[PDB]
Structures are given as structure tokens and as C-alpha cells.
């Protein structure tokens, strides 16, 4: 853009501002345009970064490196050499080759009710959607570290069972069973109040219901109940009694 | 010369704003035709309708309703030119005033209307021009009071200019 | 069989409790024909938990609604499901906007974990969000199945047939088998129900008050060999089909020397003097045309028509100069002229107020003859004051100095149906000599079409091929430079980077070019997009804007296009009465041991009956029905009695290029006023009305209105007050308000109207609505079609028929060949006989008996087959000629084909296309990090914030304009349920959420999963959120304030910082807002792929930097 010249600020140092989401652009030249015939410029200097350049960094894959000082991403021969025994908890390891030499592949697959958390050498935990990922001993290093985490079905709310209070002594983690108690006047009707949590992140079918009935209506003063069935305490929501 | 988008937004306001309140005349302000003070008209006269007597309140409500309703309905196939818009606005103002007896109600509250009228207000907007023009035709005592007031504020804000314009 | 017609007013039915309802798996399958303009959202059938007082959304619903609910534009089929175990509703919609008036087979399969919606037997939707059984048997009595529309009056308008339902999720093979049965009735263990509609009340019950629909007979479950050969994206008529254009390219018999009768119209004075064009010009131009088109088997019978009117010869026939224009205070170069008063003063600025004295003089003044002085108040236009031929610049006087070509055409009332009428005007524009009607235009066969030209160039040597270019316009030939210069923008789907039949000029032999006036190859920089240069541009082609001397040829594709357009559009123009041949080759349906069934296409013009003049049968259709377009239109003038009026736009066929937009080719309540005048608002609910009349009164069966635009604000009354049918009896049949869709035309069945009907009266209260055109279809065997004789056919084979058969005529377009021999090869063709006259024989088809053919369920790649669905219907994923349709990959024999995009599976070619299935693919991502910890401003057990942790359930769908936030929303998203709702304090509590992540890192963008956008139904304000990025040093990098919307959900917010500064590893994202109605179920860091200046700012030789892991760490190897 347009910048104001001054001998006091000479040599003028202008910072660079652009969208950091987009990669940079390797400046081959600097164009300075002006409407002043009296402007004389004796040199233009690129004041570069230390070691960062997202231009070629944007396109990098495992097996190739990025030179810090020169700031570009190029294929490399060495590096990635660390393959001990691949042990992943709560996971199945389908190893392409039993030996842990350079190029050995092993597909780690999370089991039922498990989330695949991928921990690599730095601060990027990317939980891949695919339960199975093949970690390769690329030149003798497992390119990714993997683990399987359990799952939970969250707490059951009133939508699960109406007119009930839910107690979860063991929580909601995979395998838990939460008990719903029918808050009065609701009553338990069924076989079991322990709703089970599966791997789906969602609770089991309601083996019992919490029925809410109004009790026998109090006798209206100076009035007699005309509905014979209403002497009972079993009156579902919306039951009518004529007085 | 009124902008087409202005026409669309004014008709949207009119079909949206109800008969009562400043809503009809609020959107009419800031138009390309520069006819201003309508929002000021509604705002000030709804301030001062309480100072007006009961017949004054009845007349002012009737006049506001007539202005909103008629100006909404007759805003039909008039040409885009602003002079026609100003002419029809003045015609509607005078029609509502005559059909709702502006003259006698003004006579009962000459001092109040003297209080509202300002030299800058008449210098700026043609609506208040129409109001004061009809006011000078609403009673000898009323026109005399209006002339005294307009002379007072005109000389206050003009000095010798008002006197030299008012030759005799 | 039988079918059920629903009027959409509530003719709903409940399934009787005598039949059980499936709990885990089911498959619904129904034939249907959906009328347009359904009340969105519209339901056709649904299961509801009638006892679930708070959550009625539990269950399943099928129907049609609009994608992008706001300003409804995409009416498509949909199915929604919510199992009782599931906490919310998932839903899916059709792949394309549904085509009304078509018999389609719709199915929906649920196996308990996979929800699938398939149209026409082809897969278009799959999902797996809802899992497990739909409901426990305990609530079985609560579930009720109710059809025809939801209890919310989300009814359906149209026809339903063969209501079938299995208790299992059938496979694609199974559903296609059921489709090819098309109404077979038999009991199966998995089939819950199979309704023949014979006794509906046996298994169904009506609504209250006897809201019962109508029962009719199914006309046809399916129709083979779909004749609806829709033209391509740039195609507008059947002439644009590749198959027919190839057939015309191969058949020189189809291109026998094309005698075309073209008429040139000339104007003289009253005494037959002062011709518009001299006879020498006419003869020279005719000779140039002949030299140009003999090599293309085209000859021109030159007819000359003369008109004599001195009162018109003196005046000026402006071209491209609208009468409504001029005096609009804006300079119009095409209207700038001295006889127009320099655009009526717009193109001539001067010190006007010095000529105010010239006003009121009663004598014309040039300075007063401008818009500012009202053109002297018409004094210059007054014939008595002065001459009007050079002074009347006011565009109101009937005695104006100038007119337009369209008004002259209205005066003339010529016979355009038999000749290409040629008119003359002033070509003010320099790029062309005039504007000509397209063959696909309304006026091509109407008396309004023609070619306007400048006599200054007509018959002039050196300028003679520009008229050839105008004729090329009139013959449907696109510009050879189209696709580069005529594009709307560089993203126009008609990019002609290479010469092709579907891009730009639609000719494979015309090289790409820009809008180049000279006849040389354009140099660098001539590209509008600038991407590519131009090679071997057809400047020698007559069509290019090259100079007329250099333009000297037409490419063979253009020749075939002209042949086809003459054969279809210009049937009445050519001499003789030879019947129209069949456009495309007949297709082999199927062969038995000794018999094979053959069908073919109707005539290209579509006239199945004799072409007799006067009688309406020249527009009769199959089944002895008639279909017509809007003949005449009128409406009342605002603020004026009566009104008369005659909007030609509202007449004829629909002509708008793109619906859901205000287009000038449509009638409008606004378009009936003076542009330089305030448009009066249409009156109170009597109905601002436009009336239409038809050329032939007739007993109708259905009506259709091509709406193009509608007000988006009020209710669902479609902005239409009422429809008033006009029968010959004089009765005004009211139809009430209807429902509109911005693209799909409104369709209405007219069963109750058994009387002769001539017109219609559409009543609307809209002040922005537009109507393009209208159309009417007659009942079966209407008396207007009985008296006339339908065309027949004769099938001829190589070798000829063994039995001496005269083809026994063909009125059903059907034949069966008894003479067959295994392995023998036969060539087939047909000739259309219109009584005694003989048409061009159809292209031959080579068939081998007992051999694989396109459509036998087995692919024959030697025939070029890409898919063999054993079906001859397009739109099922396999085209008519064994080529896989766009975006529909499939395998297997027969090819069970699916909409590959959006189903849920990603493949190699979906990486660059299906962001829905594969995500974004630029090198700045895109494996998104999801929240691991979530702290919120208002945390509660009812509405926890830790639901933001991780990716929320995709079954959650953003609800626009929420009345209130129920507890169901809180189970997946966090909103401030703890705080009360004081309207004097709800705008100050800045509710915020801090989504923390497992490991801090920068992100390319931010994903915000909005369950509720926070917008209130009664408020037009869209809530604003202050997004800030919290990094490792916990600095609150406030990205700023952004506007929420359910349409953009999941909202993608780009992230920008300063280059002079490094990144910052974002541990958490804080979203702050003043809206209590905002509920967010999760925030995702769209992580940068392989770059991070944070730790890169400290690197030295001997230590490396992990690209993807985006940090600089000491290393052991390398540097050797
Ligand atoms: Ca103009
Ligand atoms: Ca004059
Ligand atoms: Ca081409
Ligand atoms: Ca039209
Ligand atoms: Ca085949
Ligand atoms: Ca097919
Ligand atoms: Ca896909
Ligand atoms: Zn052209």
C-alpha cells in the first residue's frame, strides 16, 4: 500500500501484513511506485524471518523434512528411526510384519466403545474418525502414537424417563447403569429401573416407566362426586371427575 | 426525483406504521424531497397536546389520524417530482385542518401555539409554513397574536433584518 | 389399480390400530405424483407418539420441504427420524429439487442403525446417526401412523398409489424388484402392509369431520422410454440434444436442400415512395445470403412485403430505445440522439434555469424541449404549435417523432408463423446491427418476432455478413466466442476452454475466442478471464464478430444446428406440407424368442394429429387432449377505472431463464405503472388482479402458473389472494389463496370444472410478485381433439418384412416384429405418415437377435455402455443410452446406482469435490481438533457446558428463529438455562463459553456448532458473538464480532493475524455473546496443516522442526 516518505525514517522499515491462513509468497522482487520525480532510492532490503515459512510448509508429509534456516520443505533421507514394541491399550494390533524393521506397518484399531486418540511428538492430539489407523515404522519409527479412550452415554435426563430422578452411583462411563426413581406421584411400572449404557453413547431401553396419576380427588365442599371410577387413586394425566 | 428505493421504503413504512403515533411521519423524514419536520410535528404537538384543552386534544388526535390515513391512502400514482409531493402534502394538511376545525381550537389555545411556534421552525420547514398560513386565517385576535409572536422571534433571531423585510 | 388424490386442505388419514408398527426396521415404498406449491414444510406420512406431551418429534416423517428454510428455494423430498432411545431428530432430503407432475417411486429403509432415503429406486440419501430400535414395545400403543400431512396442517397435494411397507430395511436389489413389479399385490412375511386403495377404510380411518380425500384410478404406475429429453444446461430446446444433432449430422436426407420462405418487410410513404430499403439492397443481400448458404443445403425463397403509411415513414424507428426510458436523468448512449433530445436532456447538461421564461409561451422551445422543462409541457409535441417529427421529444404524445420496433410489430400483425419477417430500424449500437428473436423465444413463431437491421448497412457491399450473423442469432446459433466473453463471470458453467457441444457456442468445431471485432487471431490480453490465450479462432466463420469480409463460412456443427432449428421451430416457415420425421432412432425395448418390441419418438414439433388450419387440434396432444399457453393478458390500471392493459410478458410459454428472481419478462403489479411515478400500492383484500384469456375455450383438467418471484415476508398464503376461473358460462369460480414456490410452478387439478373455460383471474395482494406465464391441460378425449386424425407410422426393415405387411399403420407408436431369426442382423427405421404424405425415414437401428443390447440389465462395453439398469428412464442414475448420469457412480448388472456425493463415503474423485464427505483439502488443514475441556459462563446440571467437549452429535440441526430453548437442546448444547429472562437485563449478561482442547495449537479456521443460532422468531436481529483465541500464554486474541446464522452452521470463521508476529498455540476458544438463546454444542479448531512460526522462531542447526506437529525440537540424526 501507500506509505509516507521521510528522511528521518530513512532507511524506512515497513512491516508485512497479510492473511496468516493463506501461505506466504517467496518475494523475488520488491516493487516501489511513486509519483515523485525527486525520489531517489539506493537499495531495497528484504528483512526475512528466522526459520518459518508456511509456503512450502503447507505441503509436507511424513518422511520429508523442512529446513529451518532456509525455510522450505524438502524430501529427506534420514530421521524417523524409533520403533520399540508397539503397545496400545484396549486396541487390536494387526501388524503387517512381526519384525520391527524399517517400513513395518501395524494397524491399531480401537475396540468396542473406544475413541482413537492420536498423540504425536508435539501438541496436536487429533482424534481420527476412523477407529483403525496403520502406524508404519517409516525408516524405523512409528509415525504416530495411538491410544484408545473409553466412552460415556452422559447423564440420563427427564427425556429418558419422565417424572423421575436419575441416580448414577458409578457414573455414565461405558458399562454403567443409572437408576431412575419415580418422583411422587409417579410410580414404577415395569421390570427394571437400571438403564444400561452401551458403546453408542446412549442409554438402554426403559425397562420401567414412571406413571403419573392424580390421587382420588378431595370431596368438593357441598358437592358429591358423580364419577364412580374417580374414587380410586389411579387417574392418569387428564382424567376427569364430575361433581 | 424521489429515489425508487426511497419510494419502496416509504411505502413499506406506511403499510407497516399504524394510523396513530409518529410512525407514519417518522419515515417520511430524511426523504429526497427535503420536506422535514413531520416527525418534529408529531413529536412536539404530542408533547403539547396536554397543554391543549380537551377540545384541543380531540382536534389534534383527529388531525393526526387524518394526516396519517389520508397521506397513506392518497400516496398512489403521484409523479416522482418533489414539487407535486409538497403540493399534495400541503393540500392534505390544510384539508385535515379545515375538516377538523383548526381555527377555533387554535383560538382557544392561542398562547400555547405561540409557545410551540419558533422562528427557526418556520424558516426551515414548509409544513409549519402551511400551519401558520392557515393560522393567520383563523381569527383576528389569533392572527394578531401569531403576528406579534412571529415578529418577536424573527427580530430576536434577525434583528434589523426582520424590520427591514417587514417594511410596514 | 386405484390412487388417492389429496387436495392438501387436511384430507388426512390415520392407520388403524389393528396393524402392528415396526420397532427396529422397516421399508416404506409408495408411488406418488406431487403437485407443486406445497405448504412448506409438507408431510405425506408420519409416525407420531401421541402420548409424548413435550417431545412430539419422536417418530418418523416423510414428505417434501425446502432446504434453506429462509426465503424458501429448494423444495425436495425428505425423511426425518427420531428413535425414542435417541435424544433428537435426524433428517435427510432429496438430491435435487423434485419435479412436479411426475410419477415417482419413493422408498425409505431403516435397519435400526442405517437410515436410507431412495428416490425413483435410486439411492440418494444414507446416514447412520440414529441407532437402535425406533421405540420400545411399551409405547407401541402410543405410536400412531397418520398419512396425508402432519397434524400441523402440513398436508400434501397430489396423488398417492400403492402404499407399501415392510418390517425390514430392504436392499437396493429388493426395492428395485419391488419397483419393477410396479403394483404386484401379494403377501410376504416381512411386508407389513400393501395397500391397493380398493378398501382404504378397512385399514385406515379419516380425520374428524369426515376430511376424506378423493379416490381415482391409477393412470400409469410407470411409463417406459421417458420422452422428456431435457435440454442441457446451455440447451433450451430439443435441438440442443446431442443425439438428435448427431442424427442430423449423419442424415443428409434430413438435410435435403432446405427451402426456407423468408419475408422482408419494407415501408413506403402513402404514395408508395421513400422505401426503408431499396430493391437493389434487397436483391444484393439475398444474393449474398444465397452464396453463403448454398453450400449448407439451404435456399431462401425471398418474399417481399410492402406497407404504405406516410404518417410512419417520417418518424424515427428507434432500436433498443425503450419508450419508458429517455428523461430518466441518466445518460443512455443507446438512447442518446438528437431526435430523442439527447436522451431527453439526460445526455445534454446545460445551464437550464435561464430558459424558464421560455416556458408558458405556447410555442415550442428547444431548451424547453427537455425533461427538466417537461418538454415545454407538450408544446413541442403539439402538432398545432409546431411539427412533431423533429420536436416531440416527450414520450407521452401519441404523435411522437419516434417509436420502437415492438409497437410497429403490434401494429403490423404479420404472419410470422410462415415467414421470417425482417424489419428495419437504426442500429445505434456498434457491436451488432440489431436484436433478433431466438427460435426458443416466445415470439419466434408469434407475430412479434423478427430481425431488425440498419438500412445504412443493408445491401451494402462490405457489410453483408452481419445480417447473416443476425440470421444465425435467429437460428439458435450461439456466438463462437461464447464461453469467454458472453459468460456472466469466470465461474460460469459454460466455460469453453475447448470447442465442445455443451460449452459456450455449443459447437465442437468452433475454437474458443473472445469478443473480437477484427478478423485476426486475438493477441495477449484479449482474454476476459485472462487465464488462456486463443488459437485458430473462427473469424472466418460467419457467426463471429469478425469483419464481414473475413467472415466467410459456417462450421458443420452450426450447419446441423440450423438444420435442426429449421426442422423443429420453423415447421410452418418452409414450403410444402411434408410431415415431420421422428427426431431420434427407435429403441429396442425387449425381444422374445421370435418377437421384439419397437417404439419410437413423437414428431419433433410434437403434433401427433393432422396439421389442419383453424381447428384447435393443431395443439392437441396424445390421448386426444389439448395443452395451451397463456394467450392474452390484461389488468386494471392503478388509480384509474377499467384499465384494459395487455402485458405480453404474462402470455405464452414460460420464458424466464432463472426463477426465484425479479425478471423483466414477467408481469408485476409494479410493472403496470409509469416508472417516473410513485407506484400505487395494490388495494385491500379484494385482490390486485391480473386476468388471462386463452385462444381456445375448453373443458380443463389442470392448470399451471409459472411464478418467478414472490414476497418472502408474510405467512404462507403465497402472496396470492385468490384464483378466479373464467368459464364460458360467465361464472367466476373462486379457488382461494394458494401456496407458492419461487421456482416450481403452481399446479392445480381441475376435476370439478366440467365446463368450457376460456380464461383465469389471478388475485394477489403482493407489491413485488411476478408472474411469467400460464398453461392449461385438457381432460382425456376432449371434443376439440375427436374430429381430427392422429398421425400414423410405417416401419421398414432391412431385410424387408417377410410377410407382405403394410405396417398396418401405427397410432400407438408401438410394433412387435414377428419375423425374427436368432443371430440375424436387422436394420430398423420408421416413416411418419400424415395421411398420404411421406416424411423422412428415421435413422436406422442395427440389432442382432439374441444379443446383448443397451437396457438388458447386463453391461456391454463394446456398445459403449457404462451402466445397464435394464431401464429406459433417465434420472435413475443411468441415462437413456447406457451412460452413467452425472455424480452417480455405480456397479453391478443391472447397475444399482447411487448419488455418490453426500451419502457418507469419500473416494478419490470426491476429495476435490465432496467437502461434505471428505472435508476441505487445501494445504492449510484440515484434521480438526475438538474440545477436550469446556468451561462456560452459565454452567448447570440442566445445561452443562462440557457438551461442547468434542464433536457433538451431527444429528443436531440448527433451529432458526427459536421461540424458546427447551431442555432437549440443553442435552447436546450449552445455553444459559440457569439465568432468568428479564427483558431489561438479558442484553447485558455476556454469556460466554471457553472450549479448551486436549493439546494447544493454532487453527486455520474455527468451527462453531450452533444448535440454536439465538435469533428470536419475533426479532430480525441476528446475534453477534465476540470470538477470541486463547493461547498458551492465555492471551485473549479477540478475533472480533461475527454474526450467527443457522444456514452457515457449522459456522466456519477464518483466522487472520499479523505476519510480523508468529502464531500462538490456541489452547482454548472463548465465544462471548449477549444472546440467552444461543446454544453451542461444540467448538473445533480447524488446525493448520503443517506450519507454525511459534517454535520455528527458535531453531538452530542440529535440531529439527516437525511440519505436521508444528513445533521445533532437538534431534539426533540428520546433517550427514
Ligand atoms: Ca433516459
Ligand atoms: Ca416554450
Ligand atoms: Ca466451440
Ligand atoms: Ca414472459
Ligand atoms: Ca446393454
Ligand atoms: Ca432407465
Ligand atoms: Ca460420498
Ligand atoms: Zn450478436
Author numbering:
A (entry chain Q): 1133 to 1375
B (entry chain A): 44 to 211
C (entry chain C): 94 to 1213
Sentences from the paper on this structure:
Although first discovered as a placental antigen present in the circulation during human pregnancy, the metzincin metalloproteinase PAPP-A (pregnancy-associated plasma protein-A, pappalysin-1, EC 3.4.24.79) is ubiquitously expressed in human tissues.
We find that the 2:2 PAPP-A·STC2 complex of ~500 kDa is a highly flexible structure with multiple contacts within and between the subunits. The 500 kDa 2:2 complex is composed of interacting homodimers, stabilized by many intra- and interchain disulfide bonds, several interdomain contacts, and several bound Ca2+ ions. Disulfide bonds link the two PAPP-A subunits and the two STC2 subunits, and a disulfide bond connecting each PAPP-A subunit with an STC2 subunit prevents dissociation of the complex. In particular, a specific disulfide bond between the subunits of STC2 and PAPP-A prevents dissociation, and interactions between STC2 and a module located in the very C-terminal end of the PAPP-A subunit prevent binding of its main substrate, IGFBP-4. However, this truncated variant is also able to dimerize with a C-terminal variant starting at M5, and such heterodimers are active toward IGFBP-418. These data underscore that the M5 and M6 domains, here identified as responsible for formation of the dimerization interface, are sufficient for functional dimerization, and that the PAPP-A dimer has a trans configuration, which is maintained upon formation of the PAPP-A·STC2 complex. We demonstrate that IGFBP-4 has an overlapping binding site in the C domain, consequently defining this region as a substrate-binding exosite, and STC2 as an exosite inhibitor.
